[PDB]
Write a protein that binds this DNA or RNA. Sequence first.
RNA 1: AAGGU
Lengths: 56, 193
Amino acid sequence: ERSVRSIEQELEQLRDVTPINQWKRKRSLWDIKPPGYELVTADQAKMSGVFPLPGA
Amino acid sequence: ASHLASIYGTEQDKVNCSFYYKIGACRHGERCSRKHVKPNFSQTILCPNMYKNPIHEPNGKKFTQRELAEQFDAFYEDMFCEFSKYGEVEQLVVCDNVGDHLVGNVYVRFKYEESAQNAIDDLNSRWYSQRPVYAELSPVTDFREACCRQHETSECQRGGLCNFMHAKKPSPQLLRDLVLAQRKYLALNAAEE
RNA sequence: AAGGU
Ligand SMILES: [Zn+2]
Ligand SMILES: [Zn+2]
């Protein structure tokens, strides 16, 4: 199959590129919860009304 | 005479909302007189009010122009890398508007429709920057029909209150490094079979 | 309930 050949030609081409699953994010703000909300899920916080959208 | 003319999704359509069909967000929201059709199958997802531009903060005019560019690149990198875990990302758009319906809106278009559905099912239970993440499917298909035309050249006289997307583009170095990194991640998940 | 066809 030429599918396996079309992959090895791209992997050797992308030798000096780091894959996206191995990017070292220095200051990622994901999964950071406010102080006190360690036991509160994201669904319970949106329904509580303490975190409303600018529309509401 | 080759095809019938339609007015669906247009500003002349008086039952469908043209602004929600093209931009994915209307200034009236759920109180609008015209219909906002929420798609069940879509490639584009919406995370309203995710990008908080420091310029619109009390202590957020203390940064210089070079520091502001690196801060937005850190945000765009933090978005593209996390959204890539839900499949292939075709385009990432960040809105720099001030209207309550388009302030800090983040649109992400995946290649497959199943990739977008799995994203909203996981983002609605996660957090970002001490705030719960709102995720929903957006009917936006072509961003060219939703971006402000007078904003690409010079600036729009309506300012931040424009009803069209004032997309804040990142640095070309980061955008190129993200596309090359995504193809490498997808090529690595292909030589397994 | 508009600027966008
Ligand atoms: Zn509307
Ligand atoms: Zn504008």
